[PDB]
RNA sequence: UUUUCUUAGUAGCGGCGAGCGAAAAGAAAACAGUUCAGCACUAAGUCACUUUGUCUAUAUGGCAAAUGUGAGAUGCAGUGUAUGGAGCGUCAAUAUUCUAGUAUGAGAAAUUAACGAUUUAAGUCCUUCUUAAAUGAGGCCAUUUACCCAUAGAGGGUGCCAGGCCCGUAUAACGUUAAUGAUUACUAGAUGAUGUUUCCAAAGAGUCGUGUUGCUUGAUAGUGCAGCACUAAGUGGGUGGUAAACUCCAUCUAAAACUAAAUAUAACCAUGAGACCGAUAGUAAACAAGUACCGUGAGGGAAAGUUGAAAAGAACUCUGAAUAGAGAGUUAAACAGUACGUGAAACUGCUUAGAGGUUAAGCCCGAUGAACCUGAAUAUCCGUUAUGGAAAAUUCAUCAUUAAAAUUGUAAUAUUUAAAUAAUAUUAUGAGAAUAGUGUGCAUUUUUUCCAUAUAAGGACAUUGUAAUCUAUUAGCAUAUAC
RNA sequence: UGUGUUUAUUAUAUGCACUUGUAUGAUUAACAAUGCGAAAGAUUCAGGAUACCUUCGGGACCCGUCUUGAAACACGGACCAAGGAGUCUAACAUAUGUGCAAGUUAUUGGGAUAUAAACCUAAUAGCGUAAUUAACUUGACUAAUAAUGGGAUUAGUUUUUUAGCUAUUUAUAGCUAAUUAACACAAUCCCGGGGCGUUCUAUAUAGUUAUGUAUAAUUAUGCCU
RNA sequence: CAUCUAGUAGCUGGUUCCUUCCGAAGUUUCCCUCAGGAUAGCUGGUGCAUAUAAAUAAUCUUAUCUGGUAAAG
RNA sequence: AUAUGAAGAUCAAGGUUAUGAUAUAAAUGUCCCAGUGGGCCACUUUUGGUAAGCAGAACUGGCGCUGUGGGAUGAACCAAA
RNA sequence: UUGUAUACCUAUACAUUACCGCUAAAGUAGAUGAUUUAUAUUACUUGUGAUAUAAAUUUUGAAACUUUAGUGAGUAGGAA
RNA sequence: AUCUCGGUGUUCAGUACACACAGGGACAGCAAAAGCUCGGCCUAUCGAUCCUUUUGGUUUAAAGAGUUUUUAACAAGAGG
């Protein structure tokens, strides 16, 4: 909000001359806010003031004496033309659905075509189209070849205001590396894809640079014939020319006595204006506005919580009745009795295959009696537990 | 007016380089210093000086001549050369993608530039590779 | 100038009735035209929402002149904003050097009413007409009202 | 219709589309009225643009007591005291309108300076270069030094916003106005009741010697 | 006076319902004021003809003569007008000068306007495609990479999209008209105010008005208008949004007349435009359209634009009685040959491919035969391997050295935001990187860049079969305990 | 609960390095067979109502409409193409957007010029900031400091008072049940006060002032009715 | 015949793109009202006040009051 | 006849918020916002009528506005949206 | 036909799962040597931490990504 | 069977009238007094705007100002 703080815009001479002996601070308009939705709406309502009225003729479709055959004449009840012998009787008159009728509601010449925008809202949009004619992120996004343009804002001398021939004028644009946007103007020269071609707008190009000047010694004649270029006075400043299309960031070339006068037209960040009586510059909703510096920022960063980071995808429900590794996870002590019954079930087996095999009683070695006669003689391994453990 | 987060919201739905392309909802943007042509936030034209552009060549079909970051010391009001500082690695594939990860000691856009450079070198690889095809 | 893209003619394409029902669908004037009939079938709508319609409370002024009951008024509430901005508190030194001679007929005002909560300084107000409480709170602080046209 | 609606009152029962007026010559009437003023002002002399004199007094009612607009007049007895010249003032252009009879003296002294203010600003290009009594100057000629052709000749005005704030401070702490208006009201409220008892009670002694 | 804004959808008016509905003031645009009748104007002081002199438009003119004949005393001129005047008187300025005319030229165009198809800058420069056509694509010393011009890059034409081929366009020149009026000449008319002041003094009649009656209005015990009845006054008469009577006050001066400007404009004469329509649209009419046609008549009233760049508008032969068919021919193309741009659907003649007693057909879902179509391996197990070869940068090669260009972080100065703070330039500083140059070395074993050689395989891919796991689920057996 | 008598059973005491063993933190992952995406063009596998045709089983009435109910023996519709129906305006309302904010809005005009646009701007006016009453009158409390005054319900606030967790410059921080303050923001609920109107009434009106009893001379000198 | 005139119609007919979400009413009062309104209900949209008890609100149990129908006479 | 009433305004003292189950988020405004204001069927209770696929009501559930399964068939039945 | 028995068949219902939407909740925004991860030197605890040298991922149309749950009939009608 | 000022019930849209009610402020009747009498023991017995017309203030206005008549206006009834 507080205005200059990238200040010293340098004046460039004819020969692009990386400075001069002059140096101007930013005229404080260029830190006033660029709201691109105010400008879109203010531009839109204001370019309707050049419209012309259209309407159909007020007596068209209604030049017939046609009444209705009613019913029951086997034909539908619309106003049919009267007489005889001429293809036109009795044919269908007066209706939107008829062929020759009046249109559904005819267009009238007292539509509201023009518009009243608040004056303070057309000052808001002019200001947001001058603060975007600095900022080379925004001139570079309206197209606008400016990667060889010296400074933003381009201030040039008052010697450009005396250019008198179009030959001299294109050298200035050549020397200041402005000509690469004119060459993009010639490559955009087309025909319209209407309908507008029959209505006197077949076409020429797209838009180029805007030369804001203060006095006109010769430069509106000299820049008149170059495509894409137009010259404008400081005090007027059309918004329709400074943000064409409702879009911000036109490449604008000031002169120096058209850059001295922006502290008079629009006010300053301390005082009001001189030439727009009562106007103060609009205040933004955000002074600092760099969300990148703010999100760092150690006043903010020392109070935040934590990013606590593990992300919980974490789904499938396993069935803990045919699983065991999900049953022994949810209920340990399932494991304890699942072992305590499976160990007793393995002990019921040995007492059965022993008591059956008393009619065969073969072995005692490894084949069908490893899982039998080994544990039948590991009760000697619990003869120790009664005998040697009574020493405590 | 100074910020890039402000600058983006002024352009994030209409600029000269935004390419809306009818179905896959937003991947494209054609500005000359993007590195992954998407309109994202700051893979973008002007970032105010971490606009990293890996480009060929200049001598096609040589090498990856990198338009680098343009950073602070001009205003960033742009050139007649003033703001842009343009350094170009060559000679290999392995020993210039290391002298571009080394020219960028700071890490964020590096791996978009290490994939745009590794695809410019592939894009002029068919002048040596993929021969006569008998 | 208005949209139509957002209007609902463009969303009712093409559903048959266009917002209006199969049953008692859009016909020309099914209650009459305008404010009729306010005493009969639109009775309830006129009381409620509009009581005091239909009658006559009276005195006919053939040719009212609204230049007769003109009287622009001003409370004590403001009254100090009329005198300039820094004399507000440049007199509360404390130093009673000043009762400001205020003339409201030069400020466009004709009566001084009294809603107030006024400060303890003297003033010299010159309105045409008086509120009684206005002149009772300005006399309570050492002021006047010079009864002047 | 259904309800809560600021009862309609719109006067379109009367076929008003034959009465519709459209104003697209409003830009085109700004241009022609301006170009009539330009062509008028080029065609006079160095006379003023507008430009006769148009006196100043007094919008009529209470609502506009205070405003002091431009008249149509100058009042044959406003001319008379100002060294004019009632049928000389039509030619140097002084608006001489004579259905205006001047009511006050203040209204006549408000506008007798204004007839000497101008005519102390009015240089009288002569007839013969004999300089009968202009009596301004020879070489302040309309050959030479005039041709500026001012627009409005204005009221001047000259503060009346106002505010040159005086302070006294004043001593009138006894002299009330919340009762001075309730008594000057009921003086005139009761004028006829007090003047009827005056011609019965104070005419009771006339029957003594009658 | 009139027009716009506001007053105001207000005051009022109204089956006080539906509804209706002004004006003063205020703000603008524009401004311009006057003339009669009627008096102590105090010599008909006037006018129209006609004729005769005699001016200089092709004059319902100019002057004079006869004052010839008439209008005129039942009232013509001058003075003078309700906003009133006319004479005396003063007092203060005061002629041979002015205002308005026509005549005349100041001025060797002297200005300004409007109008003139009389006049213009720069490419048809060199290659592609059309090789039907270039206006399209490429190119054109540097001047800071316009080929040139440009105060001209509006539009239109020309075989495609043209600033530079043409008309125009921009600025102008020339040409024509008109307006200007320095002087001189003649015919008129005139030669102020007034602090002030005595006398004289004419102000519109079946008209205001009132009653009634009718319509009209916002106008309410009357807003305007009219008919009838009644009919004035001269400190009178009208009005002051409530009728009447008294006493006031304010305010105008009706019953006669003229008057520019701002304002309106579907017509006419001439123009310019457009977020308009694009041939069932836009006028009814893009065309020989208010036509053809219908009606006794008043009236009703259409449909219908497009070959091609150029008619090059199909010579000639054969067949036929023949329009024509067939072959040629022109053309970039006749699927451009007069349904002449394109050429849709409905509807079908012929071809081709299957099938046919199976709700009348058509349909949905899931398949099917035939036809056609779409997509799909980029290197190992229990490894983007050990070896071995091959090439080349010659800042890199590891380094050392140098020359720059920025970054980051310190310092400082000038600017904003004056104290620090910040941000912006302009300098300096350091460490680490990167760019181009040289060299134990060019490969000194490394660095970049390619190829056969091990482990479990062609592993990867898709389509399957297998085997195991997990979810949801189906069926089947029986190792024991309790009641 | 206690303790031993006791006889049984679970848990903890598995550190270091490695590996083709669960949640892969909705796991599907492996072995093997077929088949090479040929320089231009085959083939293998899987898929495809493309517009059909063939074949078969299931489903399957004709849409629009008004109607309690339509396939209806209700009406419309033989078929195609083009045309064809919720608009503009005046006024108001709510809502949302935007600008300014005790204001606001130039838009009738005038300027300044660059062109029906854009730019600047006087004086007004509208609406708002003050209402009520038929009208005449009258007109919103001593906040210079109480948002409606007071109360209740109250989001928030270094507020503000009172044990431990956590980093301990042994500080300071952040979190809970607590002491407060605040208009306790807003919003609801209630009780008041004020302007006006109308009605009761307390005006012995004590009174209080003032044209009047004072003189000077229009004026300023007294108490009283 | 032409115009006023696109006269009016509480009545018949038609009212033109897709998907997503929420989802009626045939009742109240009143009307020269009964083929129609206005009204309230039912609907949707848009919010707003309160998100890392002891706020309340709706069918049963308990306590209490109410009732004249079935049955009974 | 009480400046003990009765209402109100304050300080004192009160374990464990005083059945159950639920929380589709509930509260509150505005557009008075659209459509609607012919209904019809059924159990149960009902009135008129000899009766009626008739007339009129109470109650809750349905069709209208709704496919799908079952009743061969079918607005409403049974099941299920 | 009446009373039963088992075993089957059958919805767009129910359960699980895949996918679409809608609803409701939650996360994420130090890029400067920011965060990690695997190695490679030292203070040291046994072990971890820090400096240094060895590869990547991240400028999430902040209207975007990410996570989890439920849910789905519709004329008149409203809304995105 | 009075004067007044609100409030409530019914009908209801929670509109009106009307009918009932429960109060406050008077002023009066009966009664020795308590008592609470605001028509009829309770449930029915009735009526907008405009107009006209009384009573009423001891009034407000007719918009240049007084005076009286006239008219109007406001409160409460009646005429339907």
Curated annotation (Swiss-Prot), chain A:
> One GO MF term, please?
structural constituent of ribosome
The reply on keyword Ribonucleoprotein is yes
Any one GO CC term of this protein is: cytosolic large ribosomal subunit
| Keyword Ribosomal protein included in the entry's annotation | yes
Question: Which InterPro entries does the UniProt record give?
Answer: Ribos_uL4_C_dom (IPR025755), Ribosomal_uL4 (IPR002136), Ribosomal_uL4_dom_sf (IPR023574), Ribosomal_uL4_euk/arc_CS (IPR013000), Ribosomal_uL4_euk/arch (IPR045240)
Write out the GO biological process terms. cytoplasmic translation
Checking SUPFAM superfamilies in the record gives: Ribosomal protein L4
Q: Tell me the domain of life.
A: Eukaryota
Task: For this UniProt record, give its keywords in alphabetical order, as a comma-separated list.
Answer: Ribonucleoprotein, Ribosomal protein
Q: Which family does it belong to?
A: Belongs to the universal ribosomal protein uL4 family.
Protein name according to UniProt? Large ribosomal subunit protein uL4
Gene that this polypeptide is encoded by: RpL4
UniProtKB/Swiss-Prot annotation, chain B:
Keywords noted in UniProt: Ribonucleoprotein, Ribosomal protein
| Gene Ontology biological process | cytoplasmic translation
| Entries under InterPro entries matching the protein | Ribosomal_eL28, Ribosomal_eL28/Mak16
The residues forming the signal peptide are none
Coiled coil ranges:
none
> GO CC annotations?
cytosolic large ribosomal subunit; cytosolic ribosome
Q: Which family does the record claim for this protein?
A: Belongs to the eukaryotic ribosomal protein eL28 family.
Protein name per Swiss-Prot or TrEMBL: Large ribosomal subunit protein eL28
Q: Tell me the organism.
A: Drosophila melanogaster (Fruit fly)
Gene that this sequence comes from: RpL28
Swiss-Prot record, chain C:
- Give the keywords, sorted: Ribonucleoprotein, Ribosomal protein
Q: Region annotation Disordered: residue ranges?
A: 1-37
Keyword Ribosomal protein attributed? yes
A GO BP entry is: cytoplasmic translation
Mind listing the GO molecular function terms for this protein? Answer: structural constituent of ribosome
Asked if the Swiss-Prot or TrEMBL record annotates the protein with the keyword Ribosomal protein, the reply is: yes
The record ties this protein, via InterPro entries, to:
Ribosomal_uL15, Ribosomal_uL15/eL18, Ribosomal_uL15/eL18_sf, Ribosomal_uL15_CS
Q: Tell me which GO cellular component terms the UniProt record holds.
A: cytosolic large ribosomal subunit; cytosolic ribosome
The protein's matches in HAMAP family, at most eight in alphabetical order, are given as: Ribosomal_uL15
In its UniProt entry, what is this protein called? Answer: Large ribosomal subunit protein uL15
Species source reads Drosophila melanogaster
List the gene name.
RpL27A
Curated annotation (Swiss-Prot), chain D:
Any GO BP annotation = cytoplasmic translation
PANTHER family the UniProt entry points to: 60S RIBOSOMAL PROTEIN L13, LARGE RIBOSOMAL SUBUNIT PROTEIN EL13
- Where in the cell is the protein located? Cytoplasm
The biased composition feature labelled Basic and acidic residues covers: 198-210
GO MF entries: RNA binding; structural constituent of ribosome
Its recorded name reads Large ribosomal subunit protein eL13
Q: What does the subunit section of this Swiss-Prot or TrEMBL entry state?
A: Component of the 60S large ribosomal subunit (LSU).
Kindly report the protein's main subcellular placement as a broad class: cytoplasm
Q: Which UniProt keywords apply?
A: Cytoplasm, Ribonucleoprotein, Ribosomal protein
Q: Into which family does the record put it?
A: Belongs to the eukaryotic ribosomal protein eL13 family.
**Which Gene3D superfamilies does the annotation name?**
1.20.5.110
Source organism of this protein record: Drosophila melanogaster (Fruit fly)
């Amino acid at each position: 909000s507080l205005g200059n703080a990238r200040p010293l815009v340098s004046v460039y001479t004819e020969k692009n001359e990386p400075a001069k002996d002059k140096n101007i601070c930013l005229p404080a308009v260029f830190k006033a806010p660029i709201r691109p939705d105010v400008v879109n709406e203010v531009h839109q309502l204001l370019r309707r003031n050049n419209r012309q009225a259209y309407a159909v003729s007020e007596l068209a479709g209604h030049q017939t004496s046609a009444e209705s055959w009613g019913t029951g004449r086997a034909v539908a009840r619309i106003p049919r033309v009267r007489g005889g012998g001429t293809h036109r009787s009795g044919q269908g008159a007066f209706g939107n659905m008829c062929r020759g009728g009046r249109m559904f509601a005819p267009t009238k010449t007292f539509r509201r075509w023009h518009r009243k925008v608040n004056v303070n809202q057309r000052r808001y949009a002019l200001v947001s189209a001058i603060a975007a004619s600095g900022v080379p992120a925004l001139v570079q996004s309206k197209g606008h070849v400016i990667d060889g343009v010296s400074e933003f804002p381009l201030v040039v001398s008052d010697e450009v205001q005396k250019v008198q021939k179009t030959k001299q004028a294109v050298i200035f644009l050549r020397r200041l590396k402005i000509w690469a946007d004119i060459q993009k103007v010639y490559k955009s020269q087309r025909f319209r894809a209407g309908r507008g071609t029959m209505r006197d707008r077949r076409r020429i190009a797209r838009r180029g640079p805007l030369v804001v000047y203060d006095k006109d010694e010769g430069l509106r004649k000299a820049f008149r014939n170059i495509p894409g270029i137009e010259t404008i006075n400081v005090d007027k400043l059309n918004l329709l020319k400074l943000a064409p299309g409702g879009h911000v960031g036109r490449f604008v070339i000031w002169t120096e006595s058209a850059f001295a006068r922006l502290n008079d037209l629009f006010g300053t960040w301390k005082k009001p204006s001189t030439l727009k009586k009562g106007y103060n510059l609009p205040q933004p909703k955000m002074a600092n506005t760099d969300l990148s510096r703010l999100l760092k920022s150690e006043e903010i960063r020392k109070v935040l919580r934590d990013p606590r980071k593990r992300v919980f995808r974490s789904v499938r429900r396993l069935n803990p009745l045919t699983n065991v590794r999900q049953l022994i996870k949810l209920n340990p002590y399932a494991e304890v009795l699942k072992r305590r019954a499976a160990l007793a079930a393995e002990k019921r087996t040995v007492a059965k295959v022993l008591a059956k095999a008393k009619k065969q009683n073969v072995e005692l070695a490894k084949s069908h009696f490893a899982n039998v006669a080994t544990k039948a003689a590991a009760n000697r391994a619990k003869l120790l537990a009664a005998r040697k453990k009574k020493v405590a | 007016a100074t910020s890039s987060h402000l600058n983006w919201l002024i352009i994030r739905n209409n600029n000269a380089f935004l390419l809306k392309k009818r179905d896959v909802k937003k991947p494209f943007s054609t500005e000359p210093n993007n590195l992954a042509s998407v309109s994202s936030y700051r893979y973008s034209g002007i970032v105010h000086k971490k606009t990293l552009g890996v480009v060929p060549a200049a001598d096609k079909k040589g090498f990856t001549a990198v338009l680098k970051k343009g950073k602070y010391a001009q205003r960033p009001a742009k050139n007649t050369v003033r703001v842009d500082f343009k350094a170009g690695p060559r000679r290999s594939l392995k020993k210039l993608k290391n002298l571009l990860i080394g020219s960028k000691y700071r890490k964020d856009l590096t791996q978009a530039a290490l994939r745009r450079a590794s695809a410019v070198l592939r894009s002029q690889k068919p002048a040596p590779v993929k021969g006569k095809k008998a | 100038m208005s949209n139509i893209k957002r209007k609902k003619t463009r969303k009712l394409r093409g559903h048959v009735s266009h917002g209006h029902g199969r049953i008692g669908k859009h016909r020309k004037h099914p209650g009459g035209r305008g404010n009729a009939g306010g005493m009969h079938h639109h009775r309830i709508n006129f009381d409620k929402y509009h009581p005091g319609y239909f009658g006559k409370v009276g005195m006919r002024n053939f040719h009212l002149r609204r230049q007769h009951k003109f009287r622009p008024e001003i409370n004590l509430d403001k009254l100090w904003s009329l005198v300039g901005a820094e004399k507000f508190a440049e007199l509360e030194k404390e130093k009673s050097t000043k009762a400001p001679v205020i003339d409201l007929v030069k400020f466009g005002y004709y009566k001084l009413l009294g809603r107030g909560h006024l400060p303890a300084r003297p003033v010299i107000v010159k309105a045409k007409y008086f509120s009684k409480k206005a002149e009772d709170k300005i006399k309570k602080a050492g002021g006047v009202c010079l009864l002047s046209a | 219709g259904k309800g809560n609606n600021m009862i309609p009152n719109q006067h379109y029962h009367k076929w008003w589309q034959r009465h519709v007026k459209t104003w697209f010559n409003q830009p085109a009437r700004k241009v022609r009225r301006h170009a009539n003023r330009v062509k008028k002002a080029k065609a006079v002399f160095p006379r003023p643009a507008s430009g006769a004199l148009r006196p100043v007094v007094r919008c009529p009612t209470i609502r506009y007591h205070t405003k002091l607009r431009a008249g149509r007049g100058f009042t044959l007895e406003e001319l008379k005291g100002a060294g004019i010249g009632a049928n000389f003032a039509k030619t140097i252009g002084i608006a001489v309108d004579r259905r205006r009879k001047n009511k006050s003296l203040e209204s006549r002294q408000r506008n007798i300076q204004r007839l000497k203010e101008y005519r102390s600003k009015l240089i009288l290009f002569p007839i013969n270069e004999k300089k009968i009594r202009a009596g301004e100057s020879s070489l302040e000629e309309c050959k030479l030094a005039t041709q500026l052709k001012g627009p409005v000749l204005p009221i001047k005005n000259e503060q009346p916003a106002v505010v040159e704030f005086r302070e006294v401070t004043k001593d009138e702490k006894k002299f009330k106005a919340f009762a001075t208006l309730r008594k000057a009201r009921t003086d005139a409220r009761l004028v006829g009741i007090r003047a009827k008892r005056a011609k019965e009670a104070a005419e009771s002694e006339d029957a003594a010697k009658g």
